Amino acid sequence: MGHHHHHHMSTVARIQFRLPDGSSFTNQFPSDAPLEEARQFAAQTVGNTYGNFSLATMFPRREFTKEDYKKKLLDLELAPSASVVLLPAG
């Protein structure tokens, strides 16, 4: 685009966990911390409600795989902010 200044403020990522309810909750996830943390954190809240929900990013909409969870957050460019999409099954 036209810049040459990256990495200076911080080294963490921000994700917004949404849901069918309409609202969403924002959390703090480092650029290295596992992505599953956001998944388990949301699931731990309700315990058992969504069931078989699917998590994905807003754009460019590429879906999430088993590797996306095991790996870090910034691995898929989540910093400094990102959005998710819940696809519950019931």
Curated annotation (Swiss-Prot):
Localization of this protein: Endoplasmic reticulum membrane; Nucleus envelope
Induction: By ER stress-inducing agents such as tunicamycin, thapsigargin, DTT and the calcium ionophore A23187 (at protein level).
Tissue: Expressed in many tissues, including heart, brain, placenta, lung, liver, skeletal muscle, kidney and pancreas. Accumulates in Alzheimer disease-afflicted brains (at protein level).
Domain UBX: 10-86
The protein's assembly and partners: Directly interacts with VCP. Interacts with UBQLN1. Forms a complex with VCP and UBQLN1.
Role noted for this protein: Involved in endoplasmic reticulum-associated protein degradation (ERAD). Acts as a platform to recruit both UBQLN1 and VCP to the ER during ERAD.
Domain notes: The UBX domain is required for interaction with VCP.
Name of protein: UBX domain-containing protein 4
Organism: Homo sapiens (Human)
Part of the whole protein covered: 317 to 397 of 508
